Amino acid sequence: RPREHPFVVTEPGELARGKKNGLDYLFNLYEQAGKFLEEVQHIAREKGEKCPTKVTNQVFRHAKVQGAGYINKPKMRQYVHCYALHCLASDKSDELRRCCKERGENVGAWCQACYLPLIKMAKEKSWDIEGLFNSHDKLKIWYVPKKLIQLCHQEKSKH
Amino acid sequence: DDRPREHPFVVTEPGELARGKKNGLDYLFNLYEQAGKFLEEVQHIAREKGEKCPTKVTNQVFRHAKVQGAGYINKPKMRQYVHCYALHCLASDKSDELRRCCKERGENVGAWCQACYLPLIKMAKEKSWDIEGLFNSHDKLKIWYVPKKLIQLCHQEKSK
DNA sequence: GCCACGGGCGACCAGCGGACGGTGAGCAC
DNA sequence: GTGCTCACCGTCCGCTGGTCGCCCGTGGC
C-alpha cells in the first residue's frame, strides 16, 4: 500500500485539489470503518466467535486486508473528536471549518479548534461526554479518548 | 495478607446455609452483586477525577474490591461461574430446580457448572442464538464479559 | 537540487482479559 | 492422622488500546 496524501482544511462541499485529501474524505473513513466493523461482526457470528461492539485492532486488520489500510488506528484515534463534533453538531463543525479555512490554518490547528465546541456540548448534557458518544449510533463504536474526557473535566473544574 | 484463602463452594438449595468450612451458592451469587456495587463506586470515583469510566467488571474493579477488603471477589473465580450467575439472572426458577436436582443426586460444584450451560444454550436459541444479546439485555449481566466457551457452545448447538 | 513544513502511520509498551492447574485445605472414619 | 477429594486463586501469557514521534512526502525555489 502507498503512503496516503496529507489532509487539508475543507468546506462541506469543497473538493481537495493537489496531492492532498479533504475533510469530507476524512469523515468518510469513519463510515467505512463502521461498515468493516459490521462485516467483522457478521463473520464472527457465523464462525461462533466473540462479536466486537467497537472499532478494534481486529477491525483495522480486516479493513487492511480488504485493501484499506489507510483506515489505521493512529489516524482514526487522532481525529475522533473532529468526527464527533461532525456527528453531534454538523452546523458548528462546518462553520468552524469555514473559519479555519478563511484564516488559512493547517489540520493540526483545526484539530485543537474542534475540542472546545465539543466541551461546550458536553457541559450542556451534564458534562457526560462518554454519554454523548454512547447516545449517537455512529459514535457508539469509537473509544472515547482520555484527552477529551480530561478537557471536559478541566472545564468543569475551572469554570 | 489482604485475605485468607476462602472456603470451597458446595451445591445448595435456594436459601440453605451450607454448614461446614464451605460456602453456598447464594453466597456465590451475592459476590456478583458486591462486584456490581464496587463497579458503581469505581465509576463514581472516575467521574469525579475526570478519568475513563468502565462499563464492565474490569481488573481495575477487582483491584478496588481487593483494596476494600474483598479479594475473595477475584477475576478467576468470577469468570469461572458467570454462566451460573447468568442462568440465575435470566431463569431463576430453572437455576433453582437445577440446584435442587444436583443436590438430590449429590454432585460437586464442578458438575453443577456443566449442567448450567445447557438451559442457557436453550435460552440463547430462543432469542435467535444471540447469547451476547441476552447478557446486554439484562441490566445485571451487561457488566460481565461473555465467556468464549458459552459463545462456542451456543454455536455448536446451532451447528450440531 | 536544497531544504524546511507538517503529518501519516510504524513501533513500542503498560496493562488487560483470559486461562490453567499447583497448592492447599477438607472430610469421614 | 489416614488416604484422598477438588476448587481457590496466583501467575503467566498473547494480545490490545494508547501513544508519539520518525521518516517521508511536499512545496517553493
PDB file of N, CA and C (backbone and C1' of nucleotides) in Angstrom, chain D residues 10-26:
ATOM      1  P    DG D  10      -4.556 -14.739  44.852  1.00  0.00           P
ATOM      2  O5'  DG D  10      -3.042 -14.903  44.363  1.00  0.00           O
ATOM      3  C5'  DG D  10      -2.195 -15.817  45.054  1.00  0.00           C
ATOM      4  C4'  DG D  10      -1.329 -16.595  44.095  1.00  0.00           C
ATOM      5  C3'  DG D  10      -0.372 -15.747  43.260  1.00  0.00           C
ATOM      6  O3'  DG D  10       0.854 -16.455  43.135  1.00  0.00           O
ATOM      7  C1'  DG D  10      -1.823 -16.942  41.820  1.00  0.00           C
ATOM      8  P    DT D  11       2.216 -15.723  42.697  1.00  0.00           P
ATOM      9  O5'  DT D  11       2.679 -16.636  41.467  1.00  0.00           O
ATOM     10  C5'  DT D  11       1.816 -17.598  40.860  1.00  0.00           C
ATOM     11  C4'  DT D  11       1.963 -17.594  39.355  1.00  0.00           C
ATOM     12  C3'  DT D  11       2.783 -16.445  38.765  1.00  0.00           C
ATOM     13  O3'  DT D  11       3.585 -16.953  37.709  1.00  0.00           O
ATOM     14  C1'  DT D  11       0.647 -16.470  37.781  1.00  0.00           C
ATOM     15  P    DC D  12       4.944 -16.229  37.249  1.00  0.00           P
ATOM     16  O5'  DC D  12       4.850 -16.473  35.673  1.00  0.00           O
ATOM     17  C5'  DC D  12       4.400 -17.730  35.174  1.00  0.00           C
ATOM     18  C4'  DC D  12       3.598 -17.526  33.912  1.00  0.00           C
ATOM     19  C3'  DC D  12       4.198 -16.530  32.914  1.00  0.00           C
ATOM     20  O3'  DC D  12       4.487 -17.236  31.717  1.00  0.00           O
ATOM     21  C1'  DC D  12       1.853 -16.167  33.207  1.00  0.00           C
ATOM     22  P    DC D  13       5.363 -16.583  30.539  1.00  0.00           P
ATOM     23  O5'  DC D  13       4.446 -16.933  29.277  1.00  0.00           O
ATOM     24  C5'  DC D  13       3.203 -17.621  29.414  1.00  0.00           C
ATOM     25  C4'  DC D  13       2.179 -17.058  28.457  1.00  0.00           C
ATOM     26  C3'  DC D  13       2.732 -16.113  27.389  1.00  0.00           C
ATOM     27  O3'  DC D  13       2.241 -16.511  26.119  1.00  0.00           O
ATOM     28  C1'  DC D  13       0.917 -15.090  28.529  1.00  0.00           C
ATOM     29  P    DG D  14       3.032 -16.158  24.767  1.00  0.00           P
ATOM     30  O5'  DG D  14       1.818 -15.534  23.936  1.00  0.00           O
ATOM     31  C5'  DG D  14       0.620 -16.286  23.767  1.00  0.00           C
ATOM     32  C4'  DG D  14      -0.498 -15.391  23.295  1.00  0.00           C
ATOM     33  C3'  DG D  14      -0.154 -14.520  22.088  1.00  0.00           C
ATOM     34  O3'  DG D  14      -1.302 -14.363  21.269  1.00  0.00           O
ATOM     35  C1'  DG D  14      -0.642 -13.136  23.950  1.00  0.00           C
ATOM     36  P    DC D  15      -1.166 -13.933  19.728  1.00  0.00           P
ATOM     37  O5'  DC D  15      -2.382 -12.898  19.673  1.00  0.00           O
ATOM     38  C5'  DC D  15      -2.108 -11.504  19.750  1.00  0.00           C
ATOM     39  C4'  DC D  15      -3.054 -10.842  20.721  1.00  0.00           C
ATOM     40  C3'  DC D  15      -3.424  -9.412  20.341  1.00  0.00           C
ATOM     41  O3'  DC D  15      -4.827  -9.304  20.142  1.00  0.00           O
ATOM     42  C1'  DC D  15      -2.666  -9.534  22.631  1.00  0.00           C
ATOM     43  P    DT D  16      -5.434  -8.180  19.165  1.00  0.00           P
ATOM     44  O5'  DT D  16      -5.914  -7.083  20.222  1.00  0.00           O
ATOM     45  C5'  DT D  16      -6.487  -7.409  21.486  1.00  0.00           C
ATOM     46  C4'  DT D  16      -6.685  -6.147  22.290  1.00  0.00           C
ATOM     47  C3'  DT D  16      -6.942  -4.895  21.459  1.00  0.00           C
ATOM     48  O3'  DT D  16      -7.852  -4.044  22.140  1.00  0.00           O
ATOM     49  C1'  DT D  16      -4.944  -4.619  22.701  1.00  0.00           C
ATOM     50  P    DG D  17      -8.957  -3.191  21.346  1.00  0.00           P
ATOM     51  O5'  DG D  17      -8.703  -1.749  21.987  1.00  0.00           O
ATOM     52  C5'  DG D  17      -8.720  -1.512  23.390  1.00  0.00           C
ATOM     53  C4'  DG D  17      -7.708  -0.450  23.742  1.00  0.00           C
ATOM     54  C3'  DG D  17      -7.809   0.832  22.910  1.00  0.00           C
ATOM     55  O3'  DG D  17      -8.131   1.912  23.778  1.00  0.00           O
ATOM     56  C1'  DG D  17      -5.541   0.070  23.091  1.00  0.00           C
ATOM     57  P    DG D  18      -8.211   3.434  23.257  1.00  0.00           P
ATOM     58  O5'  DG D  18      -6.786   3.985  23.730  1.00  0.00           O
ATOM     59  C5'  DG D  18      -6.124   3.421  24.860  1.00  0.00           C
ATOM     60  C4'  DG D  18      -4.759   4.031  25.067  1.00  0.00           C
ATOM     61  C3'  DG D  18      -4.595   5.451  24.525  1.00  0.00           C
ATOM     62  O3'  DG D  18      -3.888   6.220  25.487  1.00  0.00           O
ATOM     63  C1'  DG D  18      -2.943   4.042  23.587  1.00  0.00           C
ATOM     64  P    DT D  19      -3.622   7.788  25.272  1.00  0.00           P
ATOM     65  O5'  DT D  19      -2.192   7.719  24.565  1.00  0.00           O
ATOM     66  C5'  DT D  19      -1.158   7.003  25.232  1.00  0.00           C
ATOM     67  C4'  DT D  19       0.138   7.123  24.467  1.00  0.00           C
ATOM     68  C3'  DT D  19       0.415   8.502  23.853  1.00  0.00           C
ATOM     69  O3'  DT D  19       1.665   8.964  24.343  1.00  0.00           O
ATOM     70  C1'  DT D  19       0.818   6.773  22.277  1.00  0.00           C
ATOM     71  P    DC D  20       2.034  10.529  24.396  1.00  0.00           P
ATOM     72  O5'  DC D  20       3.342  10.539  23.474  1.00  0.00           O
ATOM     73  C5'  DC D  20       4.052   9.356  23.106  1.00  0.00           C
ATOM     74  C4'  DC D  20       4.944   9.632  21.917  1.00  0.00           C
ATOM     75  C3'  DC D  20       4.946  11.081  21.429  1.00  0.00           C
ATOM     76  O3'  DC D  20       6.204  11.450  20.888  1.00  0.00           O
ATOM     77  C1'  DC D  20       4.199   9.684  19.695  1.00  0.00           C
ATOM     78  P    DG D  21       7.403  11.988  21.810  1.00  0.00           P
ATOM     79  O5'  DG D  21       8.617  11.521  20.882  1.00  0.00           O
ATOM     80  C5'  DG D  21       8.652  10.188  20.372  1.00  0.00           C
ATOM     81  C4'  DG D  21       8.728  10.150  18.864  1.00  0.00           C
ATOM     82  C3'  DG D  21       9.421  11.348  18.205  1.00  0.00           C
ATOM     83  O3'  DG D  21      10.278  10.861  17.184  1.00  0.00           O
ATOM     84  C1'  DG D  21       7.381  10.965  17.180  1.00  0.00           C
ATOM     85  P    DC D  22      11.760  11.440  16.980  1.00  0.00           P
ATOM     86  O5'  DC D  22      12.199  10.611  15.685  1.00  0.00           O
ATOM     87  C5'  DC D  22      12.242   9.183  15.635  1.00  0.00           C
ATOM     88  C4'  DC D  22      11.990   8.710  14.220  1.00  0.00           C
ATOM     89  C3'  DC D  22      12.631   9.579  13.144  1.00  0.00           C
ATOM     90  O3'  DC D  22      13.849   9.011  12.654  1.00  0.00           O
ATOM     91  C1'  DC D  22      10.284   9.182  12.661  1.00  0.00           C
ATOM     92  P    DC D  23      13.969   7.569  11.941  1.00  0.00           P
ATOM     93  O5'  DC D  23      13.106   7.698  10.600  1.00  0.00           O
ATOM     94  C5'  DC D  23      12.165   6.678  10.281  1.00  0.00           C
ATOM     95  C4'  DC D  23      11.385   7.049   9.041  1.00  0.00           C
ATOM     96  C3'  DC D  23      12.236   7.398   7.819  1.00  0.00           C
ATOM     97  O3'  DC D  23      11.760   6.611   6.735  1.00  0.00           O
ATOM     98  C1'  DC D  23      10.655   9.126   8.249  1.00  0.00           C
ATOM     99  P    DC D  24      12.296   6.802   5.231  1.00  0.00           P
ATOM    100  O5'  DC D  24      11.073   7.660   4.666  1.00  0.00           O
ATOM    101  C5'  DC D  24       9.735   7.253   4.943  1.00  0.00           C
ATOM    102  C4'  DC D  24       8.770   8.207   4.282  1.00  0.00           C
ATOM    103  C3'  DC D  24       9.178   8.657   2.877  1.00  0.00           C
ATOM    104  O3'  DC D  24       8.047   8.740   2.020  1.00  0.00           O
ATOM    105  C1'  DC D  24       8.871  10.539   4.245  1.00  0.00           C
ATOM    106  P    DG D  25       8.213   8.785   0.421  1.00  0.00           P
ATOM    107  O5'  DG D  25       7.150   9.916   0.039  1.00  0.00           O
ATOM    108  C5'  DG D  25       5.777   9.742   0.372  1.00  0.00           C
ATOM    109  C4'  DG D  25       5.157  11.076   0.706  1.00  0.00           C
ATOM    110  C3'  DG D  25       4.996  12.026  -0.482  1.00  0.00           C
ATOM    111  O3'  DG D  25       3.769  12.727  -0.312  1.00  0.00           O
ATOM    112  C1'  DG D  25       6.251  13.075   1.164  1.00  0.00           C
ATOM    113  P    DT D  26       3.039  13.483  -1.527  1.00  0.00           P
ATOM    114  O5'  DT D  26       2.671  14.871  -0.823  1.00  0.00           O
ATOM    115  C5'  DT D  26       3.534  15.408   0.175  1.00  0.00           C
ATOM    116  C4'  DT D  26       3.631  16.909   0.045  1.00  0.00           C
ATOM    117  C3'  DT D  26       3.639  17.449  -1.383  1.00  0.00           C
ATOM    118  O3'  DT D  26       2.992  18.712  -1.380  1.00  0.00           O
ATOM    119  C1'  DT D  26       5.660  18.026  -0.330  1.00  0.00           C
TER     120       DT D  26
END
